[PDB]
Symmetry: C3
Subunit: 415 residues, 3 copies
């Protein structure tokens, strides 16, 4: 297993090496801040390199993806699935937020915050939106420009751009290809930077252990964060998905668990939603009787854009980092977290080697320090194996629901 997938093993070896070095080097003496900064510099370089690519990645990905929307996607069978795919995911994100505001791991007015959010969804300058944001200062009130990339405004403008360009048809073919090419270029860059990741991440972990000032309380926070992520996973899956299934399909939601149990076990084992497709097909279309015309569209697309466990993960983890730094997010950034987690959930599986840039996207969207992200990587190998399970269960329930919202249409189209 040391030759296949030589990126997870390298990252875990880097994490272990950084932890050992931090433990052995904080034992010597109070370490000078300058040499601590020198030690942690490679991690800062890595995160600067990763943040350098967020804007081109967003611009390329939104334009490329929104140009691939087809009205011939098996008729309504597509759109219904989409209405499912963006629904549950959003709920998951919101649920995660609630839990991270209830468990509280890691111990301006509201109207003005919401007005600033609405203003930021509609920026006045597109070039200024790339590196600045707006806020209401007070002494009458006035509006002042703060530093920080306007993620939501750019995302909204380019969503509108992609929607308007997809309606041009074949006339705008030279541009859809253009951005298309750009996508691979930036994706190639993301492949190279993540190869330097094992050497950088370790350094950051060392920089987090040398100057933590307390080892017994940070390990309690990193345990409570795992506890709330796990609790969110069970709540979302076990309660909501059968409940959403029963209020629409109106059949027994436990026979569905009985039918897709092998797919759940395979997802737990392999920890990959794409490699579970052969098992989940044989489960859905043989054990439950779902028509082949539904699964062959729902499952391959849900395995790429229906990541409802990653959304909850990313909604919990951003507010956890904010709580560790003492930042109390107002109501204008809770919505930003809930939206950016939903957007990043879709791009986490569509973009290869994108599990560390999607968190940076949220952190920069809400303006949080990005040096506490090192601790998140140290515990990802304990959580992904059952984030994948929740993703697979969400795909299976969507496939079971679309067969109940399109049974009559298939029956009529057969005859």
């Amino acid at each position: 297993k040391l030759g296949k997938n030589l990126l997870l093993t390298l990252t875990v070896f880097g994490v272990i090496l950084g932890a050992v070095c931090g433990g052995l080097l904080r034992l010597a003496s109070p370490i000078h801040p300058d040499v601590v900064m020198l030690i942690a510099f490679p991690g800062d370089i890595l995160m600067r390199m990763l943040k350098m690519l967020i804007l081109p990645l967003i611009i390329s990905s939104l334009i490329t993806g929104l140009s691939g929307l087809d009205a011939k996607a098996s008729g309504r069978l597509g759109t219904r699935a989409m209405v499912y795919y963006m629904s549950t995911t959003i709920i998951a994100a919101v649920l995660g937020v609630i839990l991270v505001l209830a468990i509280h791991p890691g111990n301006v007015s509201s109207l003005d915050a919401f007005l600033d959010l609405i203003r930021n969804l509609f920026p006045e300058n597109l070039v200024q939106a790339c590196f600045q944001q707006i806020q209401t200062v007070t002494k009458k009130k006035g509006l002042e420009f703060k530093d920080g990339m306007n993620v939501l405004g750019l995302i909204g403008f380019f969503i509108a751009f992609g929607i308007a360009m997809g309606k041009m048809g074949d006339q705008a073919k030279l541009m859809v290809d253009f951005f298309n090419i750009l996508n691979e270029i930036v994706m190639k860059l993301v492949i190279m930077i993540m190869w330097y990741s094992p050497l950088g991440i370790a350094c950051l972990i060392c920089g987090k252990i040398i100057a933590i000032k307390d080892l017994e309380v940070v390990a309690r926070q990193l345990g409570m964060y795992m506890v709330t992520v796990i609790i969110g996973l069970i709540i979302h899956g076990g309660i909501f998905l059968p409940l959403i299934y029963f209020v629409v399909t109106r059949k027994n939601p436990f026979s569905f668990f009985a039918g897709i149990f092998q797919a759940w076990i395979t997802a737990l084992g392999t920890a990959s939603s794409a490699g579970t497709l052969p098992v989940t097909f044989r489960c859905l279309e043989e054990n439950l009787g779902i028509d082949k015309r539904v699964t062959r569209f729902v499952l391959p697309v849900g395995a790429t854009i229906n990541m409802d466990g990653t959304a909850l993960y990313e909604a919990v983890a951003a507010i956890f980092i904010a709580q560790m730094n003492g930042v109390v997010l107002d109501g204008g950034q809770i919505v930003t977290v809930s939206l950016t987690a939903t957007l990043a959930s879709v791009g986490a599986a569509s973009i290869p080697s994108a599990g560390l840039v999607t968190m940076l996207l949220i952190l920069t969207a809400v303006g949080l320090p990005t040096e506490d992200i090192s601790l998140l990587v140290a515990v990802d190998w304990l959580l992904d194996r059952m984030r994948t399970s929740v993703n697979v269960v969400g795909d299976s329930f969507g496939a079971g629901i679309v067969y109940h919202l399109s049974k009559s249409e298939l029956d009529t189209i057969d005859s």
Copy 2:
């Protein structure tokens, strides 16, 4: 008339509804500023959305238009017309400025202002020109960057870009198409935003009536502004156009009025310069004897780029808004108004549903608040019907002049 052109009726209904709501709601009690801002927020959103599109609109339009210049446009018959089209329009703009500085509706050195203007025509950074400008502060002097998009520098650079790219020929065909596509995209956006305009504009009008602090003096300013716009229209048309005609063509300029009177009446009635073309053709080439080789080029292009009433309108209206806000423009912004009005006059008819973004372009070029633009929309339906008349008369005089600067050339090319 409630089904055809369901944008002007919607806007006038919104204006009336906003006026009624503002009158009935200022009668109740002194309204809290926070709820006034909440009421006017949709208009702010609308103007943010409209200002978001100015830079891409300029970049696309200049490149697309300047690439369509052909040297085979009936030989000199084209260029002479162009020399006319950009001449009178400029004069109109300048005349408007003079009048708005003489009637005065709505009661740093000059050398440094002109030097700052010349510096802004040649920016040092293209990305910084999109959101910043330069100015001379004083205590030796020094140069400091102020906020505000540099419209003139971007316009000049992209004029040079389009001129240089049009000389490449067929080699630069992949790029002219590229920007070409972009044009429709942004134009499509301008079509959507102006559908939300009826709901937004009304709100702004309400926000202008609730907190105006005086109703008897603002209605006097809005009357004097109409008076000066009307006076400018009669001066420009009646005095200048026959006078410019007589010093070149050297024939009677009143027989020309006698010949094109039906076209003037049709322009007054229909209030559209494009729909008057069938009448103005039958007037020019049948009542006055203009050769068909001149009119068939002059009229269709003059109906799109020779808008000499809109230039005077936009030059008067920007300085009127500046005077309402107490801003006294120096000599460096009078030239900016005179230039941006000329540029926006051409783009007002070329870009559909662009009569509210062209004024925002001038306001942001000279850095003026854009909440007083709501009052301009309330009186546009009283002025456009005779702005169109001036535009049609200017087209007709240009067609009558080009036939006197190209009579011998046509006579020789016939034999």
Copy 3:
């Protein structure tokens, strides 16, 4: 000679006229600062126009050049030459720096400066890199954004972009052409602006003579700068090139001078490295016995990218301008000078009429005033005639070395 090459004669006439006007006008009375600024304004306009094009020039040139790298460039015969071409040039630049820090014409910590340099090679925002840079202020330390274009970060990002896009192959053909077209456009602009150069440069020279406050000491600095440039040229060529030749080729490096003496004389006379190619071919492949398979690749490419005299010139001249202004560059800007001189050396011969924008690139890279560049132009005609000689000698030694690193390969490929 007044009809052929009517750009150098125009520039020298402008320099002489400006010098005469400055001498005759400083004799009258102490000249008012406002009229001095008015006199020097055309030069400021010229340099604003030249700086407006640096970013698009860099973006187009890096992408276009890095997409033309072929692995079929005579096998290794290409890459070895490249390893030579970028080696000696770099050495030259470094040597120049040493000399300008030793002769000293024109009489934060180091760790933090190097950390800021490394941070600037990896910017966090691409749009912000176009007009801003980062630095470590002190009261704990903190990082603050300063004004000034981030040349190194943009150059590194677009080098990575071009390398990644060149590996896509034929798939990314629509984009390589796109930027390709852009190149000519911006190059055309550089051709037009340099036609206005003779009128602008003169004004700046006048502005440098009216308010110099001392004529006897500035002429001593302009003499010592020429002395150090000359000393650098002889050191680099005469010492290093034979020495680099002897430690690799291991033959007599003076017989090589004896063989290429005619090419050196022709380069001194014509002062053009491209026009010396017919003489240097007949020297290398007839007097020294170099195989035709080596010279026909080494010489045409070395005449365009192996400009090792221009690199030393530009490394000396930037620090000379910094020393004239009293600026003491730290260790983070010495490296920036050494890198930007190497990058600008390649682009000085690849881009026509680019000898005044390449110096502006370095000056803006290290953030220096660009009004002392006028004095550099007044003495360029005394130095270029033997910068070209050093360039030709460097090309010849590279051709003589590649024939010693590829003799066996050619012998085997012959049979």
